[PDB]
Design a protein around this ligand. Sequence first.
Ligand SMILES: *[C@@H]1O[C@H](CO)[C@@H](O[C@@H]2O[C@H](CO)[C@@H](O)[C@H](O)[C@H]2NC(C)=O)[C@H](O)[C@H]1NC(C)=O
Ligand code: NAG
Ligand code: NAG
Ligand code: NAG
Ligand code: NAG
Ligand code: NAG
Ligand code: NAG
Ligand code: NAG
Lengths: 364, 346, 50, 198, 220
Amino acid sequence: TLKSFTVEKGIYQTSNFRVQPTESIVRFPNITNLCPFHEVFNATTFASVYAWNRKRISNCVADYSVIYNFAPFFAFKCYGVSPTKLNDLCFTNVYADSFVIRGNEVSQIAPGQTGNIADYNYKLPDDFTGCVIAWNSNKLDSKPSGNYNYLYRLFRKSKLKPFERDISTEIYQAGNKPCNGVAGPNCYSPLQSYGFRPTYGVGHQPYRVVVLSFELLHAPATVCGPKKSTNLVKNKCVNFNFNGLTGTGVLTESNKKFLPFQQFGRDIADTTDAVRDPQTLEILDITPCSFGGVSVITPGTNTSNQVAVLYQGVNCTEVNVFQTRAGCLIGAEYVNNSYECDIPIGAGICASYQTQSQSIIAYT
Amino acid sequence: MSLGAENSVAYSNNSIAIPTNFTISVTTEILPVSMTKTSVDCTMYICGDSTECSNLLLQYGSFCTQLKRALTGIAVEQDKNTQEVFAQVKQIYKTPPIKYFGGFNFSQILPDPSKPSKRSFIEDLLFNKVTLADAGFIKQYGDCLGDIAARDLICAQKFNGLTVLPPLLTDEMIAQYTSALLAGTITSGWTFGAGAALQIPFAMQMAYRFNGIGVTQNVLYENQKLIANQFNSAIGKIQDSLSSTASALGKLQDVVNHNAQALNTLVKQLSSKFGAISSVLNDILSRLDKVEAEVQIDRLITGRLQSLQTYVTQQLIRAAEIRASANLAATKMSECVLGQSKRVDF
Amino acid sequence: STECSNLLLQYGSFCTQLKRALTGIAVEQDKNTQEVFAQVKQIYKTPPIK
Amino acid sequence: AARDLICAQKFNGLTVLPPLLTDEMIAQYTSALLAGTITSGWTFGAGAALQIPFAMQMAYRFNGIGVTQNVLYENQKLIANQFNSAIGKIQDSLSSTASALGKLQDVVNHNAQALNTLVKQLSSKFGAISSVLNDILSRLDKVEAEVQIDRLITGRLQSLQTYVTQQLIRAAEIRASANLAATKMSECVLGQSKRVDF
Amino acid sequence: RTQSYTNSFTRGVYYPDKVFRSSVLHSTQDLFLPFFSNVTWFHAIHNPALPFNDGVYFASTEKSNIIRGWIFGTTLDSKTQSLLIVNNATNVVIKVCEFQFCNDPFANNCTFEYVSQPFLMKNLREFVFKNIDGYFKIYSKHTPINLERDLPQGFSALEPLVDLPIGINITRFQTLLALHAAAYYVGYLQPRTFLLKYNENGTITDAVDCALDPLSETKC
Ligand SMILES: *[C@@H]1O[C@H](CO)[C@@H](O[C@@H]2O[C@H](CO)[C@@H](O)[C@H](O)[C@H]2NC(C)=O)[C@H](O)[C@H]1NC(C)=O
Ligand SMILES: *[C@@H]1O[C@H](CO)[C@@H](O)[C@H](O)[C@H]1NC(C)=O
Ligand SMILES: *[C@@H]1O[C@H](CO)[C@@H](O)[C@H](O)[C@H]1NC(C)=O
Ligand SMILES: *[C@@H]1O[C@H](CO)[C@@H](O)[C@H](O)[C@H]1NC(C)=O
Ligand SMILES: *[C@@H]1O[C@H](CO)[C@@H](O)[C@H](O)[C@H]1NC(C)=O
Ligand SMILES: *[C@@H]1O[C@H](CO)[C@@H](O)[C@H](O)[C@H]1NC(C)=O
Ligand SMILES: *[C@@H]1O[C@H](CO)[C@@H](O)[C@H](O)[C@H]1NC(C)=O
Ligand SMILES: *[C@@H]1O[C@H](CO)[C@@H](O)[C@H](O)[C@H]1NC(C)=O
């Protein structure tokens, strides 16, 4: 740490010591059922854009490796999470929104976008954490006479709130003269049909879109991916995976008055201090494992190769041992004398290389 | 605002004004000398036992090596300041068992052997009035592991790698230095600061002090009891002033409060996202793949490095100010205590 | 700009300590002028004869 | 017509605060110090002001530096003429030569030019596509304008931190100079100093 | 019906999230009821409805237990979905489907059902209903009020109770009446920044607004 082959007489702060974790614990809630992605990704028809169908996926085990086999799509495009990490951590609830749009308009299904779908049909929030899946439906939703079972809304008076559905069928008026239920002058139908044909270009082909929206862990988690549970141990330095939270520390039984709606406890520095066990309703306290800086007290390399180790600020039962106010000193012998200070250590304690075989001694 | 009371001193070309009586006045000057010595671990603060953050932290060069060098220089400089101010006497003098110094009552500034830490009455008042923040130089980790009630601020400071080193000189050693300086001042005079200590009666020393400022020495010997009573009443007034007014020690309280709030700000800066998706490294490392989490960890590393560099720079400027004040206090110890000063308002 | 303020809120408490530093300098300037000039208790006046 | 420097500084949030003591109060403090020095001597700095004739005060000022006091009383008119001629020489030197006050002008000029730099750094791009925020909001969508805004925010924060650090260092230097000036006011004006070249 | 006006008297603060925090002061920006605001007192002895504006706040002091429902929606008669509850000693079941209501009530998704303990247990019944991003949030808390004159002093935080998965845009709401009288306080939420104080037990015991008076801005 000095980048030298010779050191001088003094005290040097080299590194820190830390008890390594010895076990790995994964705590997931007990659950048996499997989430029905087969009904979502493989259906005989999908709903229109203006009346998109939302399915609430909950109380099951979600496996995301079967999505590729269910539908022949290219990219599992996500925005808040990663596709490869979805089997490790877990959420509170999943929402699957299914519709069929035109191929030219798939880039509008994104946070912070405008256009026609994103303004009057389907608007995503800016804080959206989820994935968007689109795949071709030229062999399922295209007719040579024109598919007229899909409608989209382009005329509306105002913008759309995120995740707001509108199935109202009223004749749009863009003038002072009222329509009075008749689609006459300056009166339009807000819903128009796509009219899909197989002779169109690749940009006008129908794309089936499924949007999987996850919400973060704020409630008891009830949908989680497949991971095996581990028996809980306490008072040991372990790695823990509590409902997707990965950390290192010691778990202690704590008397914290958690309210029944609360699940987590946070600190000043936004660190998780207390958790609730997912299987049994118990409160556990997370404390990081024992640490501390290490100082090396030595004379010069020209004099001797002997060193003493000062463990800083620990009552060292968790490592000639001498307990000082600035940690404890190992390798130096205390004497009941009083010389001048040679190497300062802490609160009135100094070390020196003395005969009274040469040795490193500590004194006041 | 009023600058002061209006005065019109009556000046003439043959008129003089001469005093006929005197007062003996005891004032109080409070000077900071040293501040809290802190140490910062970059690996625990920026990363916190995350191996990916450690691998992306060694590509930023030697920023933390020079940060640790600057903080080590400050920590050595504080002990050098205390040693320069207090350790100016070469021996440890002791007052005689007989307590008679011409009628002057030094019982409130000389230590008593009843209490273990040998401090005087006024030293006890000054130590009790300036409350401490209870920094973690005492081995507080046994209390931090066994957490009780809510978590303290000091435990949250310690868990993020922000520690406080104890000073080299304990308060008992500073009290021994102060007692040696007082004994050498009241038994010998100014001779102990320029060689060997020379015993002298205190009345003759006060005659020398009066003869230094132009007043002939017969004024003291004909008014000794009045001057002794004025000094004793002044010491009673200064203990009543220290017992009543709590705003006199604001400089040392500011010294404590600044170093407390710097560490509190450094701890509270860990909650900031710094443009990333989360302030927690494990949530980023679990929710993302390698490249995206590398980008977010790079953003958090840059933000925390900037906050640490700001803390170290402000600590360096505060250390320069404290060192200037400590040099002034050392000069005042060398001139006011070890001798008599002819400088005006010094 | 509202969007710039919303993205500036994520950067923490840099502006608080910068305002604290500038306020400390601002009160230190008046402390300097007070300790230099205000060294008398009474405002004396010269007599009318010069 | 053209926008002023102070107007462009104020429009961007840089506000200069007034000092607590007006120049009339500083002039009254200086007048009180001069009246106490002329009438009393050093006696007003150590308690109550005691009047004394100015010739006898000057005799004690000569007796301080080791000259016997009869030298003043045998040469009073010559010393008065020398003091009046030196005062007139200072008047003519200040009326003609102007480069003697180059210190305080520098105290002005740095505190101008730093603020001037703090305006100029608003024109920089810092790796973005435009230094104007409203053009970035008008031309770009959500994520790309967020990236450009993040770049501009980081650049402006870095420049403002540099300004604050330079102001702190200059404040330390000015505080050292003010401590020296307070010592000189306490020791030269309020007494007689035996320190050489002080 | 009868309409009157009352001051708020610093009531209507709730837990902003579901995270335990103890002995800290936390600053949150959310839709809150502002301190010392104008709260409309309604006496239902006689019924046009009330506008929904960024969430509402309900208070009731009815010891006689004659309030047994809240009705939401836009046009209130079929069409869009309208919430409807039934309160008795057995169930608190939720009805979202249309019924074609009358003027004096004395075909979509999200048909929530909920069988649990009764909501209505010298008592104060507080409620907060809000709607953000398609999420509908309910907050409630009992308060054993002794001095039954107006809204009492103190800080009673509101427990979050029910979050709906999705809903329709809401602009109007009603109140049920029981006949074989009724009085309720209505307040309106606004986006405000609050500084909440947590004690050692993790409960909100005090709160300071950041836009009331400049002393509170200085405290914030
Ligand atoms: C000089 O001042 C002192 C007070 O500082 C005078 O001492 C006081 O004398 C009166 C006489 O009636 C006593 O009642 C007081 O108790 C004395 N005070 C103290 C503190 O002892 C002293 O008399 C003055 N000198 C002259 C010549 O008048
Ligand atoms: C899950 O575990 C808890 C406690 O171990 C038990 O009460 C509950 O019945 C279990 N649930 C299932 C579905 O096994
Ligand atoms: C989709 O469902 C139909 C109906 O059961 C079935 O015949 C078909 O094999 C399914 N396809 C896939 C890919 O699961
Ligand atoms: C902690 O250190 C002190 C220092 O004297 C000691 O008395 C005490 O027994 C230690 N605590 C232990 C070993 O649990
Ligand atoms: C001395 O003072 C008196 C009274 O002011 C004045 O009349 C006289 O002229 C003064 N003496 C001299 C030499 O000016
Ligand atoms: C003054 O000295 C005497 C010793 O004779 C002592 O008893 C007394 O306490 C002293 N006064 C004070 C105020 O301490
Ligand atoms: C509430 O608004 C009404 C509207 O007229 C007003 O008369 C009343 O004074 C207000 N209440 C206040 C300000 O407390
Ligand atoms: C916390 O709860 C305990 C037990 O109910 C109670 O004794 C204590 O007073 C509470 N603390 C408060 C209200 O600050």
